[PDB]
Structure 1
Amino acid sequence: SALHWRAAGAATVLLVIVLLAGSYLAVLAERGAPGAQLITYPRALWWSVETATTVAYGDLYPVTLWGRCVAVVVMVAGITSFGLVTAALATWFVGREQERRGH
């Protein structure tokens, strides 16, 4: 199959994996910090989605060093996955336009 679509699918499954692992590790890192809110796995998964999409409502965020490192990993994974989807769309469009120009 075309490399851009395979990479898009791989990035999707990798982002799902990163969301689950980030929820687990965020709860692990935040429990023990007085005042921490990112301490139950359901809302941790919600927060991981918020973080990967950059749609950060501000209802939840890490307060510890390791929670914030987990957050950075989730941020970069989400941003690069969505950018890879954009790149795959651009490649598809470029190929289609080349063909439409008979080249």
Structure 2
Amino acid sequence: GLLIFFLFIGVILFSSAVYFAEADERDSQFPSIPDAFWWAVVSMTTVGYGDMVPTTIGGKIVGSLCAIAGVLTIALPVPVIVSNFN
């Protein structure tokens, strides 16, 4: 649950930031914050399909952080789970 919760926090923070950073663009791939959730989860889990990608400098900065925060976010709770399994 802690994993889901942290992921949830990150999804909302980055979806929000990428939305606004791409807002003043005619070719924005982010219609709304809720729509950007998909992009945020796809980036944090580092799956990166590429169906949604930021195009502005601010969007890419947000994107960069999103990827790194993802690795750390997931990395924190898993170890414990792996231990239990072990």
- AA at the equivalent of 1:52: M
Name which of structure 1's ranges 40-49 and 11-20 shifts more when overlaid on structure 2: 11-20
Q: What is aligned with 1:36?
A: 28
CA RMSD of aligned residues (A): 2.1
Q: What is aligned with 2:73?
A: 81
Q: Summarize the Cα distance change of 1:14–1:80 in structure 2 as closer, same or farther, 3 Å threshold.
A: same
Structure 1 segments, 4+ long, off by >6 Å, are none
Structure 2 unaligned blocks of 5 or more: none
TM-score by length of 2: 0.78
CA displacement 1:24-45 (0-9 Å, x = unmatched): 1111000112322123223201
1:1-103 paired onto structure 2 within 5 Å:
9=2, 12-92=4-84
Structure 1 unaligned blocks of 5 or more: 1-7, 95-103
Aligned sequence identity (%)? 29
Name which of structure 1's ranges 49-58 and 12-21 shifts more when overlaid on structure 2: 12-21
Larger radius of gyration: 1
In 1, the alpha carbon distance for the partners of 2:75 and 2:30 equals 27
TM-score by length of 1: 0.68
Q: Do the aligned residues in 2 keep the contact of 1:15 with 1:77 (CA within 8 Å)?
A: no
**How many pairs align?**
86
